[model samples]
Target: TLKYKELIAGELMRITHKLLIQKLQQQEVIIKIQEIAKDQQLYDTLSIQYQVDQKEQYYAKIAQSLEDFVSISALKMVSYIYPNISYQVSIGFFQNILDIATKTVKDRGALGCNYKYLKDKLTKALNLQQISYPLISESYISYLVHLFQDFNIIEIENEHKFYYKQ
Candidate 1:
């Protein structure tokens, strides 16, 4: 029994880690690429075609196989650590979104100050539940970008370059 459960749980955890890493890595690659495309490699080492994109030199890309390689290596290592455990959900995007929304709800509840703005924020979040069901909702991000997009210019500078050059 001990050996059997261990093998199953271990496998599951490893599988989970592999899936998470793939998602996380892809996000990293995109973010890095977007940064590089906006700025040169020397000034911004994140460029997809670093050397060529660079005014001088530097590096990256989250190629397609990265997902498979990450899945095998990460999950296999996890499996080694937990051979008894079992797993194979294939994806972790939905779970991560629920996690985020749950945190948002709990966080707002804790502050204990539900003013108009706070109420509106929480209401909007909850209303998401009333209608559709998407864990990683763009509404939250869009709201944030709307509120602070102008205030935050780092992304808008050399890379984001929101300002006009003419």
Candidate 2:
């Protein structure tokens, strides 16, 4: 079972890597388009308009692809633990939990917060919200928190604590 779990973990890592690439591509495309549009002379040209339209189309296409990628990947990930769970339900549960975690970290400010404290805060928040999903284990909660590191969340654990990246 440990080997099987490791295999799934590997797959999840690959999926996350692809998702990160897609996100970076989206940001790069947006930045390039914005820079092009920033010059008043360029913005007045028909070619610039065409480029803007193309950028919109590209954005739409990528947005669709990301939705499909996340939905399918999330379904597969959730199925490993809860075979019959609805995709939307599981995604909502995760989003709520993550938001709560992020907010708690943000509230702690530059002083930062310890893992045990964050875990307890999350547990209490989950209880108050009346979310029906089983309270996620500390290991899984740690995984979720660590996932945010890619998105500006920081761990300044010279002693082991998390701080919201400014």
Question: Among these predicted structures, which one has the highest lDDT?
Answer: 2
Instruction: Point to the candidate with the largest TM-score.
Output: 2
lDDT of each: 0.32, 0.45
Query: Can you give the TM-score per candidate against the true fold?
Result: 0.21, 0.40
* Clash list (residue pairs), candidate 2: none
In the range 119-166, model 1's lDDT, one tens digit per residue, is 355335534332122212233333332333354521211233377789
Report model 2's TM-score to 2 decimal places. Answer: 0.40
**Global lDDT of model 2:** 0.45
> How would you encode candidate 2's per-residue C-alpha lDDT over 1-166 as one tens digit per residue?
3333323332332333334345555651111222222333222322332443555553332232224334433323222132122122134444566688889989999989877788678767766333222233444455666667767686746565699999
Could you give me the TM-score of model 1 versus the true structure? 0.21
Q: How many backbone collisions does model 1 have?
A: 13
